[PDB]
Design a protein around this ligand. Structure first.
Ligand SMILES: *[C@@H]1O[C@H](CO)[C@@H](O[C@@H]2O[C@H](CO)[C@@H](O)[C@H](O)[C@H]2NC(C)=O)[C@H](O)[C@H]1NC(C)=O
Ligand SMILES: *[C@@H]1O[C@H](CO)[C@@H](O)[C@H](O)[C@H]1NC(C)=O
Lengths: 44, 49, 48
């Protein structure tokens, strides 16, 4: 039920933000200028 | 001959960068008391040069 | 110092009402070279 975490400053596209997702058999760590939605969740 | 303009540098920022930290944001500096929320001019400068 | 360090540990537990009253030492996992000013964070949850 718990996949990963996001680490940022404003959690929008203005500044860069980290993001970790626990792939089923991998890891998807990426630090980009993500425009995070107000309710982040990983859907399957 | 044209003095390539693709090489830029941050001339304005609101703090001092920490070691090995990268800043890529392009928000307009609010230099003076003017809000500077959107557009530029007077006391609103584009951070990069 | 511009480095994001993650340590981790997995332990088998039985009483789940709270964290166990034991002693497990987390071991280093990653030392990623990421330069950002991390101030806030949020947890991801799977939504099937
Ligand atoms: C480190 O990141 C923090 C988080 O944004 C920055 O803190 C801001 O600092 C400015 C300084 O002018 C304050 O006006 C803001 O209120 C602060 N934001 C807060 C408290 O959420 C800080 O500037 C960053 N520093 C570097 C060197 O990147
Ligand atoms: C809720 O709904 C949409 C559906 O496309 C989802 O992608 C989006 O992240 C959510 N919208 C928000 C949090 O504003």
């Amino acid at each position: 039920i718990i996949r990963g975490w996001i680490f940022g400053t404003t959690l929008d596209s203005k500044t860069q933000s980290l993001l970790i997702v626990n792939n089923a058999t991998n890891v998807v760590i990426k630090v980009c200028e993500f425009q995070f939605c107000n309710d982040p969740f990983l859907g399957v | 001959v044209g003095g390539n303009y693709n090489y830029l540098y941050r001339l304005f920022r609101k703090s001092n960068l920490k070691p090995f930290e990268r800043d890529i944001s392009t928000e307009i500096y609010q230099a003076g008391s003017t809000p500077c929320n959107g557009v530029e001019g007077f006391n609103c400068y584009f951070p990069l040069q | 110092d511009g480095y994001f360090k993650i340590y981790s540990k997995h332990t088998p537990i039985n009483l789940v009402r709270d964290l166990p009253q034991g002693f497990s030492a987390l071991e280093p996992l990653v030392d990623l070279p990421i330069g950002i000013n991390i101030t806030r964070f949020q947890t991801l949850l799977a939504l099937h």
